[PDB]
Amino acid sequence: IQRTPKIQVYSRHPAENGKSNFLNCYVSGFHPSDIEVDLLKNGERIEKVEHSDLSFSKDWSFYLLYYTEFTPTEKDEYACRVNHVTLSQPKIVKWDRDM
């Protein structure tokens, strides 16, 4: 079977402009496990990005956390770009400070 990833872009702590934080992209509920996740800053890919070890939920669907250290500003726009076989094209989910 094939399941579509649910994508969440968020920070580890509430965003304070100028305060060091962590940008998170959490993909969950997908299958198969082959997935491409890229954190974006102003459309550009962030280079040093870590991810958790592959795990899965009770229903056998996988989840992964991609994260990087960042310092939010008023102007900088962040996003997460996910590609998976269940997607017609790479999906970009922009970061909202209240989501």
Place this chain on the structure above:
Amino acid sequence: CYTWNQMNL
């Protein structure tokens, strides 16, 4: 504490 998974399908 891993177990023994040597059983074949």
Place this chain on the structure above:
Amino acid sequence: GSHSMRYFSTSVSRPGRGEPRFIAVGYVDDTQFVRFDSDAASQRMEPRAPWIEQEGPEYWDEETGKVKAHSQTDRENLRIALRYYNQSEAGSHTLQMMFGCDVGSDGRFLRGYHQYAYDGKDYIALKEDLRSWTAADMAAQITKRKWEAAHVAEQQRAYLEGTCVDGLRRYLENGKETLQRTDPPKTHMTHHPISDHEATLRCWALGFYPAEITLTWQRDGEDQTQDTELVETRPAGDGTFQKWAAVVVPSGEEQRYTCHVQHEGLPKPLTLRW
């Protein structure tokens, strides 16, 4: 209170690109503490929590040996599934496995698990009687006959009722500073107008452990069920978890809505109102 220990393994074949990729991870409750990646350089069961690094090299030799053997068993199990399902040798397939135990507040054995999944669907699973298997299709019934004849469940039960419970009690002790402390959720609420006749109320729960939580919106004491946007509980990245629930309300009717937070670390369930 009650606690759990789980291992999750995943084998993805890749014909023409080498041996299948094997990845395993171990958890105590919602805390990962070990990992094994067959493509990593160390070729060892690596630690992932601070309270497990104190284990000696004898422990790591034992765990690395058991997880390497599992990796090679799933390698030949992927070939067997091809014959069972009459699938080609060029396709990439997935074999997943979960095993572990649940202990009570005292440490007594409650339930044990040992389950297989092929390509995301159930294959075989150890029943609650720790003796018989749930075969999910005709192919798994071939496996069920093999394992019940070789009394596979007997050795697997001895681990679940013994080695699993003992290791879990040992892990809860070495990491009682983290594993046994519940963080209650810090809650707040935000307000977003969307038009001049509607607005959004978002109920936040942050920094809680363990991950199990319930967020519920109510209108005039009535659960919303529908009309409520609920996100999956997500890892904050520091060992704690987040979750929010949003509801879209007509303007001027904010105070007739309430958010209800239930969590293990809460002495009393919270009720929030804008």
